[PDB]
Design a protein around this motif. Structure first.
Motif, PDB file in Angstrom:
ATOM      1  N   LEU B  46      32.246  40.064  46.815  1.00 59.84           N
ATOM      2  CA  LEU B  46      31.977  40.417  45.430  1.00 59.84           C
ATOM      3  C   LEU B  46      30.827  41.410  45.345  1.00 59.84           C
ATOM      4  O   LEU B  46      29.841  41.311  46.080  1.00 59.84           O
ATOM      5  CB  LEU B  46      31.648  39.163  44.623  1.00 59.84           C
ATOM      6  N   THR B  47      30.958  42.376  44.435  1.00 62.57           N
ATOM      7  CA  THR B  47      29.910  43.353  44.184  1.00 62.57           C
ATOM      8  C   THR B  47      29.178  43.130  42.870  1.00 62.57           C
ATOM      9  O   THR B  47      28.054  43.616  42.719  1.00 62.57           O
ATOM     10  CB  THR B  47      30.491  44.775  44.179  1.00 62.57           C
ATOM     11  N   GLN B  48      29.784  42.417  41.925  1.00 61.45           N
ATOM     12  CA  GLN B  48      29.163  42.128  40.642  1.00 61.45           C
ATOM     13  C   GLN B  48      29.437  40.678  40.279  1.00 61.45           C
ATOM     14  O   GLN B  48      30.405  40.074  40.745  1.00 61.45           O
ATOM     15  CB  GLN B  48      29.685  43.053  39.538  1.00 61.45           C
ATOM     16  N   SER B  49      28.567  40.121  39.443  1.00 62.54           N
ATOM     17  CA  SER B  49      28.751  38.749  38.996  1.00 62.54           C
ATOM     18  C   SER B  49      30.087  38.608  38.280  1.00 62.54           C
ATOM     19  O   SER B  49      30.418  39.398  37.393  1.00 62.54           O
ATOM     20  CB  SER B  49      27.607  38.338  38.072  1.00 62.54           C
ATOM     21  N   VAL B  50      30.854  37.596  38.672  1.00 66.48           N
ATOM     22  CA  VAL B  50      32.155  37.319  38.078  1.00 66.48           C
ATOM     23  C   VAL B  50      32.276  35.816  37.878  1.00 66.48           C
ATOM     24  O   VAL B  50      31.882  35.028  38.744  1.00 66.48           O
ATOM     25  CB  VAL B  50      33.305  37.863  38.950  1.00 66.48           C
ATOM     26  N   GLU B  51      32.823  35.423  36.733  1.00 62.48           N
ATOM     27  CA  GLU B  51      32.863  34.017  36.365  1.00 62.48           C
ATOM     28  C   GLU B  51      33.767  33.229  37.305  1.00 62.48           C
ATOM     29  O   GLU B  51      34.862  33.670  37.661  1.00 62.48           O
ATOM     30  CB  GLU B  51      33.346  33.869  34.923  1.00 62.48           C
ATOM     31  N   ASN B  52      33.295  32.050  37.705  1.00 65.30           N
ATOM     32  CA  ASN B  52      34.071  31.037  38.414  1.00 65.30           C
ATOM     33  C   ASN B  52      34.430  31.427  39.841  1.00 65.30           C
ATOM     34  O   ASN B  52      35.233  30.731  40.475  1.00 65.30           O
ATOM     35  CB  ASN B  52      35.359  30.695  37.656  1.00 65.30           C
ATOM     36  N   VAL B  53      33.867  32.511  40.374  1.00 62.52           N
ATOM     37  CA  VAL B  53      34.160  32.917  41.745  1.00 62.52           C
ATOM     38  C   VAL B  53      32.860  33.056  42.524  1.00 62.52           C
ATOM     39  O   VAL B  53      32.670  32.407  43.558  1.00 62.52           O
ATOM     40  CB  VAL B  53      34.964  34.230  41.781  1.00 62.52           C
ATOM     41  N   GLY B  54      31.960  33.898  42.034  1.00 58.82           N
ATOM     42  CA  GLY B  54      30.715  34.130  42.739  1.00 58.82           C
ATOM     43  C   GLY B  54      29.841  35.092  41.969  1.00 58.82           C
ATOM     44  O   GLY B  54      30.113  35.418  40.811  1.00 58.82           O
ATOM     45  N   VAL B  55      28.781  35.550  42.633  1.00 67.62           N
ATOM     46  CA  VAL B  55      27.808  36.424  41.987  1.00 67.62           C
ATOM     47  C   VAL B  55      27.837  37.802  42.638  1.00 67.62           C
ATOM     48  O   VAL B  55      28.163  38.796  41.981  1.00 67.62           O
ATOM     49  CB  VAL B  55      26.390  35.814  42.023  1.00 67.62           C
ATOM     50  N   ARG B  56      27.508  37.880  43.925  1.00 68.88           N
ATOM     51  CA  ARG B  56      27.477  39.170  44.601  1.00 68.88           C
ATOM     52  C   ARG B  56      27.268  38.949  46.089  1.00 68.88           C
ATOM     53  O   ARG B  56      26.447  38.120  46.487  1.00 68.88           O
ATOM     54  CB  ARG B  56      26.364  40.062  44.032  1.00 68.88           C
ATOM     55  N   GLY B  57      28.016  39.691  46.903  1.00 62.89           N
ATOM     56  CA  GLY B  57      27.830  39.642  48.338  1.00 62.89           C
ATOM     57  C   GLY B  57      28.211  38.336  48.989  1.00 62.89           C
ATOM     58  O   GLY B  57      27.723  38.035  50.081  1.00 62.89           O
ATOM     59  N   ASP B  58      29.072  37.547  48.355  1.00 58.17           N
ATOM     60  CA  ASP B  58      29.519  36.270  48.892  1.00 58.17           C
ATOM     61  C   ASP B  58      31.013  36.351  49.170  1.00 58.17           C
ATOM     62  O   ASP B  58      31.802  36.630  48.262  1.00 58.17           O
ATOM     63  CB  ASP B  58      29.212  35.133  47.918  1.00 58.17           C
ATOM     64  N   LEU B  59      31.397  36.109  50.420  1.00 63.23           N
ATOM     65  CA  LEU B  59      32.809  36.113  50.774  1.00 63.23           C
ATOM     66  C   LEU B  59      33.543  35.041  49.983  1.00 63.23           C
ATOM     67  O   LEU B  59      33.089  33.898  49.890  1.00 63.23           O
ATOM     68  CB  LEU B  59      32.984  35.877  52.272  1.00 63.23           C
ATOM     69  N   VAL B  60      34.680  35.416  49.407  1.00 57.89           N
ATOM     70  CA  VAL B  60      35.464  34.519  48.570  1.00 57.89           C
ATOM     71  C   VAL B  60      36.937  34.711  48.893  1.00 57.89           C
ATOM     72  O   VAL B  60      37.404  35.842  49.073  1.00 57.89           O
ATOM     73  CB  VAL B  60      35.196  34.762  47.071  1.00 57.89           C
ATOM     74  N   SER B  61      37.662  33.599  48.982  1.00 52.18           N
ATOM     75  CA  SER B  61      39.110  33.616  49.141  1.00 52.18           C
ATOM     76  C   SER B  61      39.736  33.539  47.755  1.00 52.18           C
ATOM     77  O   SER B  61      39.726  32.480  47.119  1.00 52.18           O
ATOM     78  CB  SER B  61      39.574  32.457  50.019  1.00 52.18           C
ATOM     79  N   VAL B  62      40.277  34.657  47.288  1.00 55.70           N
ATOM     80  CA  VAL B  62      40.861  34.748  45.957  1.00 55.70           C
ATOM     81  C   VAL B  62      42.361  34.939  46.097  1.00 55.70           C
ATOM     82  O   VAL B  62      42.850  35.469  47.100  1.00 55.70           O
ATOM     83  CB  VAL B  62      40.237  35.902  45.144  1.00 55.70           C
ATOM     84  N   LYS B  63      43.098  34.495  45.082  1.00 52.99           N
ATOM     85  CA  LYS B  63      44.532  34.736  45.061  1.00 52.99           C
ATOM     86  C   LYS B  63      44.795  36.229  45.162  1.00 52.99           C
ATOM     87  O   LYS B  63      44.142  37.033  44.492  1.00 52.99           O
ATOM     88  CB  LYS B  63      45.149  34.172  43.782  1.00 52.99           C
ATOM     89  N   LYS B  64      45.755  36.598  46.012  1.00 54.96           N
ATOM     90  CA  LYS B  64      46.036  38.009  46.242  1.00 54.96           C
ATOM     91  C   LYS B  64      46.293  38.739  44.932  1.00 54.96           C
ATOM     92  O   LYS B  64      45.888  39.895  44.765  1.00 54.96           O
ATOM     93  CB  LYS B  64      47.232  38.151  47.182  1.00 54.96           C
ATOM     94  N   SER B  65      46.958  38.077  43.985  1.00 49.49           N
ATOM     95  CA  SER B  65      47.245  38.713  42.704  1.00 49.49           C
ATOM     96  C   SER B  65      45.960  39.128  42.001  1.00 49.49           C
ATOM     97  O   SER B  65      45.802  40.288  41.606  1.00 49.49           O
ATOM     98  CB  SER B  65      48.056  37.766  41.821  1.00 49.49           C
ATOM     99  N   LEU B  66      45.027  38.188  41.838  1.00 51.75           N
ATOM    100  CA  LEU B  66      43.762  38.511  41.186  1.00 51.75           C
ATOM    101  C   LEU B  66      42.997  39.563  41.976  1.00 51.75           C
ATOM    102  O   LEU B  66      42.479  40.530  41.407  1.00 51.75           O
ATOM    103  CB  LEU B  66      42.918  37.247  41.026  1.00 51.75           C
ATOM    104  N   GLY B  67      42.935  39.397  43.296  1.00 48.98           N
ATOM    105  CA  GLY B  67      42.178  40.331  44.110  1.00 48.98           C
ATOM    106  C   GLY B  67      42.679  41.755  43.978  1.00 48.98           C
ATOM    107  O   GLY B  67      41.887  42.698  43.922  1.00 48.98           O
ATOM    108  N   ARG B  68      43.996  41.931  43.921  1.00 49.94           N
ATOM    109  CA  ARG B  68      44.580  43.261  43.862  1.00 49.94           C
ATOM    110  C   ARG B  68      44.720  43.796  42.445  1.00 49.94           C
ATOM    111  O   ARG B  68      44.897  45.007  42.275  1.00 49.94           O
ATOM    112  CB  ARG B  68      45.958  43.256  44.529  1.00 49.94           C
ATOM    113  N   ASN B  69      44.640  42.938  41.429  1.00 45.28           N
ATOM    114  CA  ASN B  69      44.860  43.361  40.054  1.00 45.28           C
ATOM    115  C   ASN B  69      43.572  43.557  39.268  1.00 45.28           C
ATOM    116  O   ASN B  69      43.480  44.499  38.476  1.00 45.28           O
ATOM    117  CB  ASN B  69      45.737  42.338  39.328  1.00 45.28           C
ATOM    118  N   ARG B  70      42.575  42.695  39.458  1.00 44.89           N
ATOM    119  CA  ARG B  70      41.361  42.730  38.655  1.00 44.89           C
ATOM    120  C   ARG B  70      40.137  43.132  39.466  1.00 44.89           C
ATOM    121  O   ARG B  70      39.465  44.110  39.129  1.00 44.89           O
ATOM    122  CB  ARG B  70      41.136  41.361  38.004  1.00 44.89           C
ATOM    123  N   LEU B  71      39.829  42.401  40.537  1.00 42.19           N
ATOM    124  CA  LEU B  71      38.585  42.638  41.259  1.00 42.19           C
ATOM    125  C   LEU B  71      38.563  44.030  41.878  1.00 42.19           C
ATOM    126  O   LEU B  71      37.730  44.871  41.522  1.00 42.19           O
ATOM    127  CB  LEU B  71      38.397  41.564  42.330  1.00 42.19           C
TER     128      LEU B  71
END
Ligand SMILES: [Mg+2]
Ligand SMILES: [Mg+2]
Ligand SMILES: [Mg+2]
Ligand SMILES: [Mg+2]
Ligand SMILES: [Mg+2]
Ligand SMILES: [Mg+2]
Ligand SMILES: [Mg+2]
Ligand SMILES: [Mg+2]
Ligand SMILES: [Mg+2]
Lengths: 95, 95, 137, 338, 52, 41
Positions: B46-71
């Motif tokens: 993550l590069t910016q604070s995002v709700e319910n996932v993380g804040v910044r610079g923290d590895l996160v396993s996100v659904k491919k759909s969200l990762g490719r569509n929003r983040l």
RNA sequence: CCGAGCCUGGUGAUAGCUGGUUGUCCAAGAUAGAAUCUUAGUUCAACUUUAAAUUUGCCCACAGAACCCAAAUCCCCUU
RNA sequence: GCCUGUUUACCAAAAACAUCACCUCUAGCAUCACCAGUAUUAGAGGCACCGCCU
RNA sequence: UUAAUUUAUUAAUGCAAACACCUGCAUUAAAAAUUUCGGUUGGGGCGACCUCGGAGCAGAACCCAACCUCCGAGCAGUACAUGCUAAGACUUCACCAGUCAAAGCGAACCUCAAUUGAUCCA
């Protein structure tokens, strides 16, 4: 059978014959008796013993099998512990 | 993706030669359709604070759909490549 | 999907006209709850074995009644000889009793006016038919 | 041959052909009773369990009584003023459990139509009677006779080796080999018509269960149906063959001896006209007088279990009812006066 | 009718042989010659091979 | 290992075998005696 | 020249069916049956041809081949 | 067979096909037919004008 | 066409995939596609038969047809050594299959007409 294959021009072997018959190099063909695994519960012990045996083929049947198989199957095979090594040759045969 | 398998085995071609196919080699059976596989997750930093996932610079396993569509399209996250991981590691140790 | 497949069964697999289907849905709402397959069996039981045509099946609320009751009463009459499936020409030796005379009437009236037998015999036949259906399944 | 015909007769199953014939005949014969008879015939058949007297008869009877079956023969003997066959109450549809071999190595009981036992009971086998079964070889009545006390031998004859083999198998399964070894049981594959010549004035008790339309089996079994078109000749000539067989049995029976003519069909033609024609032929061609015994007391005694066609001239007719699906069974008792 | 049943040696050998018995009859226990043990031993019915 | 397991299983079965045969024969004989007693009644 | 157009190609389609299958001369040479979606065909057997091995082949004297209930045949030394 | 018409070009012109009329079923709708239309409409089909009874 | 095999193709739905369309997989229909329509007998029908066995034809070794005359079978019962082996023979006119069997090992001290079914494959 195929008297001349389209790719090599050679004579082919009917593998159904290989799957069923053993050729002794002398020229004899050995086979199992049909039905030796079928409905044994209704067969008498003498019939079962007759069926469980390895049987030679007629002259005409042997000729047919020789025609249907190629020369590779009609060679000398010096296998390690062949149970038919002794049977591969005839002895004391007069005409 | 649709993954298929020949019904009839193709004879070996050789080393430098190309296999020769026939009508029977065009018959296929579907071994698997990748779209029916269970969904896997995408690793992102993550590069910016995002709700319910993380804040910044923290590895996160996100659904491919969200990762490719929003983040990723919006820049809220970057691919968890070794280079990005190293860069954010220096960012962390510089704090 | 449930409503649409019920309607599609009534239309394509039962060859009911659109107006007939609407009238069926209006008069026998329990058809919707009734599962597919069972409904088709009931319809074909009326059509082939009982020889009842679509106008009659719609006019008399046949689909209202249960398949168990239908088979019980109809097979009882058929074995008694009172009922007879119409032949290829659509003709019967004796006119068949009316569906209202078979299903709508109470059990006692059905046994007295149409079957002309005893309730004891009907109970025995019902048990026998239930056993036969179970064994068939 | 002519391939293309103008109109081919519709292909009917033999069952439906038999239904057509039985309708068009028995409807007239029985009037308002034909509906009930038809439904009973097309419904399941009620079976009775004849306990093998040779086996543990008391134990098997107790087991059946626990299964809630009662001995209709026993209750009949109760108000008559040796056989044991249990049947369920009126209206009950319960099936007897399949019979199994007993401790003695013989089947505990035989599952047979209860009505088929009435001919044997009416025959009244006295202790030590020489007995003949001219054509009865389905089993059933033959086994009942053997379980009775006909220790003076029984000659069971049929014209069908297949049915003779079936009889032999049931005898092996039920009757002890000690009982069957002697001449107590003689099974033969000969023609009953020739039996008058083969033996005359020999048997004290005779049972002639002639081949008939076997209405229930014709309605149920498609195979070897008497009502199939190919067997039209046999179906048409059946009455003559039945008359011949009954005449042969009457010739065989001793003067003063008893015979029982039995039929598994409703047909007035095949039952009452058959017996009457046999009597007439015997009294004319062979000049022997036979008097038909009165079975009305038998009817009243067994009415509680079987429903009888009251409007019967000669003999008795158990009709199949839903409350008691034991019929059909016609049986006529005849004592040879001369 | 009769059923073809597999009698299995009670001697622990895998020896088996098929016999016939009435379906209604009780399960079969029977002395039979066991070639592997080279001796008569008990055999007990294991399963019904088929119906005949 | 398989050979010795088979051999020892056969050994145990053979050790039990005479008693089993005697018991089965006695059971058959007593069943026949019960049948005769039933015949006697 | 349409119950499915015409042309080209696969195509020398296939046909257990019909027809045809061209020098001289000599020689041996004719039908036990079985199986078969098989009786318009084919495989085996039988018959036939060729070459080779060695030894009995045919004809056939006695003797011999069933009780139940004719002509002959089989086997057969000699010749 | 209602009628005028149609048909097997090259063996059948008809009682056969069609036909106004009547009847059955299907469809609530637009930018290539239906249709630049919309239930008095359109499509599929039966039968055969009209008239008379039940 | 309610002959066998299919649903490749369309129309529906359902489940996945994506966030109605598209794709994959199923189910149901419509529509079609491929292929077959055994044999011997029977002209006035509404079918019979197809394999195996006994008897006459076929009298006396064997063999002998029939759209000839008759009769039957598609099992049952016993036993559980109804185990293993093996000379020599028979053989339904071929083959396939089917029969009998001395001796031996090991044990005790099957019947009768037919009663059936190959290969492959499970
Ligand atoms: Mg190479
Ligand atoms: Mg050609
Ligand atoms: Mg010449
Ligand atoms: Mg005109
Ligand atoms: Mg004109
Ligand atoms: Mg013209
Ligand atoms: Mg013109
Ligand atoms: Mg003209
Ligand atoms: Mg031979």
């Amino acid at each position: 059978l195929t008297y001349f294959s389209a790719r090599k021009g050679k004579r082919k072997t009917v593998k159904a014959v290989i799957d069923r018959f053993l050729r002794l190099h002398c020229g004899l063909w050995v086979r199992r008796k049909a039905g030796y695994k079928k409905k044994l519960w209704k067969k008498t012990p003498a019939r079962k013993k007759r069926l469980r045996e390895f049987v030679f083929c007629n002259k005409t049947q042997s000729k047919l099998l020789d025609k249907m198989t190629t020369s590779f199957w009609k060679r000398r095979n010096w296998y390690v512990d062949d149970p038919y090594q002794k049977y591969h040759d005839r002895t004391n045969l007069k005409v | 993706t649709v993954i298929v398998e020949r019904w009839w085995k193709v004879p070996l071609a050789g080393e430098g030669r190309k296999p020769r196919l026939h009508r029977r080699h065009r018959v296929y059976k579907l071994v698997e359709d990748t779209k029916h596989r269970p969904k896997e997750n995408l690793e992102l930093i993550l590069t910016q604070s995002v709700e319910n996932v993380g804040v910044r610079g923290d590895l996160v396993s996100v659904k491919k759909s969200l990762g490719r569509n929003r983040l990723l399209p919006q820049g809220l996250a970057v691919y968890a490549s070794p280079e990005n991981k190293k860069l954010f590691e220096e960012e962390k140790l510089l704090r | 999907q449930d409503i649409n497949d019920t309607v599609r069964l009534l239309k394509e697999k039962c060859l009911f006209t659109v107006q007939q289907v609407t009238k069926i849905l209006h008069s026998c709402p329990s058809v919707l709850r009734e599962d597919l397959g069972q409904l088709e069996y009931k319809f074909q039981y009326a059509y082939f074995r009982m020889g009842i045509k679509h106008p009659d099946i719609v006019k008399s609320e046949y689909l209202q009644y249960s398949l168990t009751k239908i088979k019980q009463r109809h097979i009882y009459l058929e074995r008694l000889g009172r009922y007879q499936t119409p032949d290829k020409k659509g003709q019967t030796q004796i006119p068949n009793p009316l569906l209202k005379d078979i299903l709508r009437v109470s059990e006692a009236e059905f046994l007295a006016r149409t079957a002309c037998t005893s309730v004891e015999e009907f109970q025995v036949f019902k048990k026998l038919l239930a056993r036969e259906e179970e064994e068939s399944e | 041959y002519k391939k293309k015909w103008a109109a081919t007769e519709p292909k009917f199953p033999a069952v439906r052909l038999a239904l057509q014939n039985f309708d068009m005949t028995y409807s007239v014969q029985f009037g308002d009773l034909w509906p009930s008879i038809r439904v009973s015939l097309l419904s399941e058949q009620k079976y009775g369990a004849l306990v093998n007297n040779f086996a543990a008869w008391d134990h098997v009877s107790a087991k059946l009584e626990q299964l809630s079956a009662k001995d209709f023969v026993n209750e009949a003997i109760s108000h008559w003023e040796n056989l044991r066959c249990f049947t369920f109450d009126r209206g009950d549809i319960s099936r007897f459990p399949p019979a199994r071999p007993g401790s003695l190595g013989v089947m505990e009981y035989y599952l047979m139509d209860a009505a088929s036992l009435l001919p044997v009971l009416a025959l009244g086998l006295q202790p030590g009677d020489i007995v003949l079964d001219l054509c009865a070889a389905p089993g059933g009545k033959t086994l009942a006779l053997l379980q009775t006390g006909c220790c003076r031998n029984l000659a069971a004859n049929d014209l069908s080796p297949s049915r003779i083999a079936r009889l032999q198998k049931i005898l092996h399964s039920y009757v002890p080999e000690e009982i069957r070894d002697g001449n107590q049981v003689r099974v033969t594959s000969w023609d009953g018509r020739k039996w008058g010549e083969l033996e005359g004035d020999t048997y004290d008790r005779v049972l002639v269960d002639v081949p008939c339309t076997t209405d229930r089996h014709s309605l149920h079994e498609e195979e070897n149906n008497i009502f199939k078109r190919s067997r039209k000749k046999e179906r048409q000539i059946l009455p003559v063959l039945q008359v011949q067989l009954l005449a042969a049995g009457l010739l065989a029976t001793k003067p003063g001896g008893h015979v029982v003519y039995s039929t598994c069909s409703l047909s007035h033609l095949q039952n009452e006209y058959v017996v009457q024609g046999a009597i007439e032929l015997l009294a004319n061609q062979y000049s022997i007088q036979v008097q038909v015994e009165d079975l009305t007391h038998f009817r009243r005694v067994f009415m509680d279990t079987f429903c009888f066609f009251s409007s019967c001239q000669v003999g008795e007719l158990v009709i199949p009812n839903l409350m008691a699906n034991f019929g059909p069974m016609y049986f006529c008792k005849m004592r040879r006066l001369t | 009718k009769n059923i073809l049943v597999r009698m299995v040696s009670e001697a622990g050998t895998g020896f088996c042989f098929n016999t016939k018995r009435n379906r209604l009859r009780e399960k079969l226990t029977l002395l039979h010659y066991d070639p592997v043990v080279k001796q008569r031993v008990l055999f007990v019915e294991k399963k019904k091979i088929r119906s005949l | 290992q398989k050979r010795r397991e088979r051999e020892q299983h056969i050994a145990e079965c053979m050790a039990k075998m005479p008693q089993m045969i005697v018991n089965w024969q006695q059971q058959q004989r007593e069943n026949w005696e019960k049948a005769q007693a039933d015949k006697e009644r």
